[PDB]
Design a protein around this ligand. Structure first.
Ligand SMILES: Nc1ncnc2c1ncn2[C@@H]1O[C@H](COP(=O)(O)CP(=O)(O)OP(=O)(O)O)[C@@H](O)[C@H]1O
Ligand SMILES: Nc1ncnc2c1ncn2[C@@H]1O[C@H](COP(=O)(O)CP(=O)(O)OP(=O)(O)O)[C@@H](O)[C@H]1O
Ligand SMILES: [Ca+2]
Ligand SMILES: [Ca+2]
Ligand SMILES: [Mg+2]
Ligand SMILES: [Mg+2]
Lengths: 193, 193
């Protein structure tokens, strides 16, 4: 049965994928995407994370579920992952650049949002089709954060930022998010430790 | 499956204001309702030869014409028939949740549906460790966005899908802005019966 517990959600999403989605065609789109994702999942698994699901060119990773994890660990790994994924993106662009797969098309950039809160975690769906995911306001914030941030940046919430030295806090500022009544305190963190 | 272009029809159903009622349902109250909702809704997709791509929270994504082949007219027809059965099935669930005191006497559960037909790269995307079957491209977004813009408990479709729908069944045609698409798109509100 799905039950509530504290977890950290991370969303990674490629910017403007739809554009290059043309003039790159089938093979191009499949080959690039499959590779992009190969690295990103690698980044998640290495940081003890869990790949909840892919949503188009987006990734949804969890920390703290299904395997119990300490609040500090949850955020520390999630951030390590976000910083790691970025390092892969710069190199993949270096791999696709000398392949022509990039360039009437720019390199690939992603938006990342991280949050920590409660969520009803467990198997959702029917007895014919059910997947393991996290449901709840907390998830929506993680998603909304990722969407509100600038390309090639990591935007966490205050809940997350508290485990982050203010020195690594590039930009603090409230922001109204879609579907969230109370304005959230967002924190754009530094890509480097 | 080896990713490749293919004409398909995409269906998105999303519950209206789910985050709002999750605060009056409590963890156990959300899992009960959400899982019951998914069972009846996916049953509808399956009994219309549709394929449940995935669940994006309280939202459902169904594909018609993939993996198994299906004609352009049948895709539209099954996808629409599915959306109409969902409403008939939701009406029943609302009665149940009515007695249970879960909702009704918290407004009764409602959902939005979006359907577009068009080319899209379908197949398995991901890594060797984790990869899933799904559709990718401009076509999927259009449906996702049409869902997003339609009034609660209404079925919105693109003009291409509308091209295979008897005229009297149309309720409202209109040039709208699809929060995610650059140029205005023509939309058609389908009669729920
Ligand atoms: N395979 C898939 N499964 C489910 N939803 C999908 C999907 N592919 C796309 N979508 C949904 O379609 C909508 C638009 O997709 P996006 O990937 O955000 C367009 P984009 O070209 O990448 O621009 P953007 O991400 O910079 O905004 C989103 O709501 C996304 O979640
Ligand atoms: N389990 C999950 N997996 C992936 N994305 C999820 C998710 N739960 C929520 N989201 C994402 O969080 C965002 C908002 O969730 P919503 O479905 O809109 C809650 P809502 O209160 O019902 O808003 P609504 O009334 O506009 O439908 C979406 O982009 C959705 O894809
Ligand atoms: Ca994207
Ligand atoms: Ca919803
Ligand atoms: Mg996006
Ligand atoms: Mg929504």
């Amino acid at each position: 049965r799905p039950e509530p517990r504290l977890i950290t959600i991370l969303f990674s999403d490629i910017v403007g994928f739809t554009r290059m989605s043309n003039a790159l065609q089938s093979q191009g789109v499949a080959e690039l995407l499959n590779e992009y994702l190969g690295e990103m999942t690698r980044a998640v698994f290495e940081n003890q994370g869990t790949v909840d699901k892919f949503v188009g060119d987006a990734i949804m990773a969890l920390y703290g579920a299904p395997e119990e994890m300490s609040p500090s660990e949850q955020v520390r790994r999630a951030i390590a992952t976000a910083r790691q994924m970025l390092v892969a993106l710069e190199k993949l662009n270096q791999g696709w650049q000398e392949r022509g797969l990039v360039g009437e098309v720019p390199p690939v950039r992603f938006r990342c949002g991280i949050h920590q809160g409660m969520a009803v975690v467990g198997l959702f769906g029917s007895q014919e089709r059910s997947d393991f995911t996290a449901i709840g306001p907390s998830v929506n914030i993680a998603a909304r954060l990722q969407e509100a941030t600038a390309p090639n940046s990591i935007m966490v919430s205050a809940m997350v930022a508290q485990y982050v030295p203010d020195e690594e806090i590039i930009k603090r500022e409230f922001l109204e998010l879609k579907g969230i009544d109370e304005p959230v305190m967002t924190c754009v963190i530094n890509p480097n430790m």
